[PDB]
């Protein structure tokens, strides 16, 4: 129990920061998340030998996808990490368990390829689970992996905390569905301005923890502006692949999906910072003050986007 992971001292002092990027080493990958479930949780939260065993397990059931992929997995879980250390007396021992858990697992077994996608395709993802349909699947995944001999990270929680802890699991990652995001968004919007929002209401807790998960979930527009170009590459990679499957179902997609409309995509980030990103970041900041370096980066890589547009890179 006396065996903490250290890590060099430039990323024992970024990763504190909500921009700190994991980087390209994999082999560190998963000592970066235990420092972070340590910092985070304690060193007596989880028994050492099961989380690695999850940890390596979770690790093989994302695919070698563009985006979609374990470095976003880690990545997210880093910015939840950011928030709930500096949110320190905001969350139980149970939710900071929890949710480290939720965003490393949040899309395990990931195709790249959207809901619409696997409905139009007609997956049989899409008949077992009408809507969420990759989240659901990811759930699935979390709890297969949950029980397998060895992996139980969960097993010194008394039998009602681990229906609490796997709860806060499924609603966390259910919420990464974007779709749920904007009426998730609104809800939390009236009721911050009205006054009403009560974090003693599990209803309002469980609608601040969705927000949270969009926010780690899209926290690479919050990054240092060479690292959220190069990652947009990446999304993109993604988008026009599903762009060309479309087209092989016999469907235009969406210009956002069309490799040969390549120029309307600094346009197409304007709408996704104006229209979700910003929000998304500005609701956050007015429930929890010090998670504003998040929305500061996002106004920044904005103003970087409308930079390429007027020529000036
Ligand atoms: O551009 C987008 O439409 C976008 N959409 C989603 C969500 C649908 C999965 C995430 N991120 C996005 N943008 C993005 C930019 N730069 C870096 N990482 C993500
Ligand atoms: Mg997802
Ligand atoms: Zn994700």
């Given at each position: ?8 001292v430039?990323l ?19 000592g ?6 340590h ?30 992929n ?24 149970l ?32 008949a ?34 681990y ?29 911050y301005?009205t ?12 609608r ?19 690292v ?13 692949a ?5 087209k ?28 979700v ?6 609701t ?5 003050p ?7 980066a ?16």
């Amino acid at each position: 129990g006396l065996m903490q992971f250290t890590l060099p001292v430039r990323l024992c002092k970024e990763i504190e920061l909500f921009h700190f990027d994991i980087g390209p080493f994999e082999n560190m990958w998963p000592g970066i998340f235990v420092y972070m479930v340590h910092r985070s949780c304690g060193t007596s939260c989880f028994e050492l030998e099961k989380l690695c065993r999850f940890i390596m397990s979770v690790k093989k059931n994302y695919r070698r996808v563009p985006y979609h992929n374990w470095k976003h997995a880690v990545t997210v879980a880093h910015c939840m990490y950011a928030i709930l250390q500096n949110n320190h007396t905001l969350f139980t021992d149970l939710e900071r368990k929890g949710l480290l858990i939720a965003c490393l697992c949040h899309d395990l077994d990931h195709r790249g390829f959207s809901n619409s996608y696997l409905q139009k395709f007609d997956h049989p993802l899409a008949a077992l689970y009408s809507t969420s349909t990759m989240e659901q699947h990811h759930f699935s995944q979390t709890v297969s992996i949950l029980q397998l001999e060895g992996h139980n990270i969960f097993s010194t929680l008394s039998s009602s905390e681990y229906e609490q802890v796997l709860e806060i699991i499924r609603k966390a990652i259910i919420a990464t569905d974007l779709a749920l995001y904007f009426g998730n968004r609104k809800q939390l919007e009236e009721m911050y301005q009205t006054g009403s929002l009560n974090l003693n209401n599990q209803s309002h807790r469980d609608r601040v923890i969705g927000l949270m998960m969009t926010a780690c979930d899209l926290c690479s527009v919050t990054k240092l502006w060479p690292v959220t170009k190069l990652t947009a590459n990446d999304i993109y990679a993604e988008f026009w692949a599903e762009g060309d499957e479309m087209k092989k179902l016999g469907i235009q997609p969406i210009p956002m999906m069309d490799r040969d409309k390549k120029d309307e995509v600094p346009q197409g980030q304007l709408g996704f910072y104006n229209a979700v990103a910003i929000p998304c970041y500005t609701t956050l900041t007015q429930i929890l003050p010090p998670t504003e370096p998040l929305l500061k980066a996002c106004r920044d890589n904005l103003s970087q986007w409308e930079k390429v547009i007027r020529g000036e890179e």
